[PDB]
Design a protein around this ligand. Sequence first.
Ligand SMILES: [K+]
Ligand SMILES: [K+]
Ligand SMILES: [K+]
Ligand SMILES: [K+]
Ligand SMILES: [Mg+2]
Ligand SMILES: [Mg+2]
Ligand SMILES: [Mg+2]
Ligand SMILES: [Mg+2]
Ligand SMILES: [Mg+2]
Ligand SMILES: [Mg+2]
Ligand SMILES: [Mg+2]
Ligand SMILES: [Mg+2]
Ligand SMILES: [Mg+2]
Ligand SMILES: [Mg+2]
Ligand SMILES: [Mg+2]
Lengths: 66, 177, 527, 52
Amino acid sequence: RKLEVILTTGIEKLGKGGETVKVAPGYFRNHLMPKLLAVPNIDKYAHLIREQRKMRNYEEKEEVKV
Amino acid sequence: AFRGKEMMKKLVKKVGAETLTPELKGKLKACVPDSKVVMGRAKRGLYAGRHIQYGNRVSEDGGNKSRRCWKPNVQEKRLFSYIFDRHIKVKVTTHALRCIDKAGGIDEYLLKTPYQKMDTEMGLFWKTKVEQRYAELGQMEVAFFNAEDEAKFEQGFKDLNIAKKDARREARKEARR
Amino acid sequence: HEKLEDTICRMMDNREWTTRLQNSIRDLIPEWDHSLVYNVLHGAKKLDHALQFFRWSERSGLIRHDRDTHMKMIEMLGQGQKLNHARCILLDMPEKGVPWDEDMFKILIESYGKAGIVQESVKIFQKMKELGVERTVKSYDTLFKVILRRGRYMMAKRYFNKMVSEGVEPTRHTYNLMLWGFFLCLRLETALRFYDDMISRGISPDVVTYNTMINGYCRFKKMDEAEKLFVEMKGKNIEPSVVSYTTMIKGYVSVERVDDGLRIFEEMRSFGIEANATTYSTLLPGLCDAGKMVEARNVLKSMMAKHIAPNDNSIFLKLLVSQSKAGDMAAATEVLKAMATLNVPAEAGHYGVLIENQCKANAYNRAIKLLDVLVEKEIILRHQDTLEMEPSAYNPIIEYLCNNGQTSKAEVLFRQLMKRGVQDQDALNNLISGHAKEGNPDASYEILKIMSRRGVPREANAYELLIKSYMSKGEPGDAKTALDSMIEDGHVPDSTLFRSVIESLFEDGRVQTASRVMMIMIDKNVG
Amino acid sequence: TAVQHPWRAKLDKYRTELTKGVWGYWEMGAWKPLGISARRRAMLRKEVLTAG
RNA sequence: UCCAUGGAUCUCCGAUCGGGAAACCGUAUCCAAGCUCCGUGGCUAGUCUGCGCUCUUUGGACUUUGAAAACUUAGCGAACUGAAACAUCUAAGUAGCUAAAGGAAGGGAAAUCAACCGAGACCCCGUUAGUAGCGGCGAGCGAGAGCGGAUUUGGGAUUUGAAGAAAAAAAAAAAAAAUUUUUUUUAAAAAAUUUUUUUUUUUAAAAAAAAAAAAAAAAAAAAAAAAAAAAAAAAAAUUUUUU
RNA sequence: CGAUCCUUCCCAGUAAAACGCGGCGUGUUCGAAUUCUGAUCGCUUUUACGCGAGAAAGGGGGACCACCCUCUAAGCCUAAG
Ligand SMILES: [K+]
Ligand SMILES: [K+]
Ligand SMILES: [K+]
Ligand SMILES: [K+]
Ligand SMILES: [Mg+2]
Ligand SMILES: [Mg+2]
Ligand SMILES: [Mg+2]
Ligand SMILES: [Mg+2]
Ligand SMILES: [Mg+2]
Ligand SMILES: [Mg+2]
Ligand SMILES: [Mg+2]
Ligand SMILES: [Mg+2]
Ligand SMILES: [Mg+2]
Ligand SMILES: [Mg+2]
Ligand SMILES: [Mg+2]
């Protein structure tokens, strides 16, 4: 069994931030959930991560271009 | 046996029977759990409907039968809650753990499970508390800031910290003096 | 490609309003603005979809609605008589920071007026300035449109006194609406005094103004005054309205004047556009009650020569029965084909009345031709229809068809009629006689079984001809079967039929069956 | 006059539904159960057929 | 004396304010409001005001449900005994202990039966039948469906009007067959009512003006008042009106 | 007062399955099925999300498969006997 989770930061062997990955249930439940390294892949948290990353990455892009 | 009726009696007595319309009474009967929960420790945990079974242990050659029991796979676990930002220490079955994994956390399990499936007055309390906390967060927003505003705020906190540390040093000097 | 509002409305039309549909719609929309919400609300296939979208978009925090969005919601909520919805939405607008405008209130007043709940229109007209909003001109006119339609006339007088008290100039609309209410509510001298008050202000009457006067005088049963008002109307160098001449024809149809309606019909060539649907809707009952036919067939041709359907669809059967009782049979098929070609589904009465009219005058063959396509299209088994085939419409034709040939289509027609409501004794007896004389008395026996199953009482003579049709064809065993059915029914035959039955059994070699007939005539003592 | 046939109201309510199927029908690619259960539909059919 | 109705008084335990060897001991709860009496303090000293308790009234704060035979639904659950011993089996989900609910509870309108014919929620009574089936295939245990009765019931989700270039149809002309086939041109004409008060006109008769309402209880809740004539109270010019 | 809808429900950790018991349920594991702006194909419109067509979901009927019949689970309420 695996759980689909959406990463909030970059993890070395997993993937980049905002990307959905599959992890062991104990891994997410006991490490990634309390440290806010990943959220469960449901629609409310997917929407939250997508829109907040859109705002922050848009601010970073607008700062980086000029 | 008739757990819905005895829990309804407590609910009516606590709230007040004058506050309740007939249609609200009909609705509240549909929400109060009435599952067959007998064992005392299940009323204090989150078992998701698992309950101890009693049956026969059957010998191999003779077929002799003696009474045994089947116990649920209960573990005391700390489950992280997003809306309280802390761990909640609950006696759960592993079946309830698997249901919570499917739901996406203890908060989402409490939000999505209907009132009748909570099986327990304490489960009703926790579901009500998490629903109220999520309703409070549902009327809020956060504003974000430009990187130059972020730099100004970083410098503002730095000046506050330096003022606090110099005030502490001067307080130490004056209490020494 | 596609726009976004029509696929949003397709989404709300095809799927239940769940949370995942809302999430799909929210992920579908890249940017929120007022025009998107306006075109979604305009394009919604149901009102409940529009209300769900309007509440979800203001409760999700995705947008804050503006004045025209609230206006559209209140307009279409009151147009479908969801009055508390539009009241409660309007009563939350000060708290949203969106200022009240007068036009929202006057739409809500019209909404309460369409439901005939004019008391609330009066109340909210009073409570405009209590809430602190302008009440200048349109609110008065629509309040009058609401309350004089109900028939409040002295309240109209007082409210027009308040209308002229606080320095607001009346327009032609205000006087026309109160004039319509006063002429409607049987106040002659009041409406003439208000006409004088209109003339004191010196605003020029127009086509609608003279139309209101001729409507009022036409309901006064005073047509000479309407004609002299039309003389005054022509004297004022104004173009003739179609509504004015239609009102003339309505007043011409008080008792007789179909020919005056003809005479002013050629006066439309100074107007320009003749064929409105309401004139054709209103001219037929006068000629139908009068009994005038020659100048009606040509304009029945003309109304489909200009593609016009009447406002009332029951006018076709009225003209059918009047024109058939006149005697023009061959134009009744033209009326049937016109009914089939405009919109109207032909019902059972539209064929049945013509079947009766054809049967009463020696024209049975094309009646059979009509009945064939009536059976084939199965109009009798239609549930939408209101006009059903009357007992006058099948009792003579079943008599003819059974007495003069085929009883197969007679029993087909009556079996289609039994499924609707019909268990008439005369038609079933006619089927019995027809099947007996056609050489098929088994069908008469099964019709008698239908009588026994359906609770219809049975004759004693209908058994006699069944028995003798068995005996003529050479089946006396079936004759004894029918005799048993007759005795079990409770009727006793005559000794001549007993002699014929016993002889036909004896010369057929059926000794024991004849012995049973002999025993039953012992038990009944009939010779 | 409504108690001679008290089943006309149910029949008028379910007339458009009863054309879709016996137990259910397909809508938007998925199977959907019928609005009247099979035993109640059978009772309605018996009431219709006992009156011819 | 007695009866009917309504009142006054109305010790204690069980027992619930705390303790407790049941019928005893200890108990001014606590806190906002406004009122007569009470006492003390302070002003420029008069219908002067500002601080208090005790007890009275109305509230709101803690918390006190609560008993009860059998029936019901659940949890746990024997052994003697029978099998001519005994271990599967039987006794028996019985005895017992425990919990919760109600005057009844429970069940209940088919993811049910049938067999290609059809039935039509649930429970109770009769029958099928000690049959089918289960079983050291031993001892024993033992249906269902159907049929006959009793009661006879279904309701809801749940429904919906969908407000007014080319194809087709209808008119006029044309040809042919015994009506038919083909081509050519085309704001309003519906929205229905009654009471009361005042001032006028007009031949006591009936209509004119301007003032207040009700033709709402669709939906439920809150409040005032419960039918004719007369007595008293309050307001007004004891008396009238209302109550 | 005013024509009264603004939500207990999102609905699968379910049905089934393996082992153990049992009053068809239950302990431990585990785990589906058709649509989530339906899809596919054809048509005009001549460059639609219209019009038509076909096939698509589950349970049961003494292991199991095919066909047929019948029903629609995974919490609606309900008198009397
Ligand atoms: K034993
Ligand atoms: K023995
Ligand atoms: K022994
Ligand atoms: K019940
Ligand atoms: Mg005590
Ligand atoms: Mg023994
Ligand atoms: Mg037993
Ligand atoms: Mg017992
Ligand atoms: Mg009890
Ligand atoms: Mg009781
Ligand atoms: Mg009951
Ligand atoms: Mg029976
Ligand atoms: Mg099977
Ligand atoms: Mg089988
Ligand atoms: Mg069948």
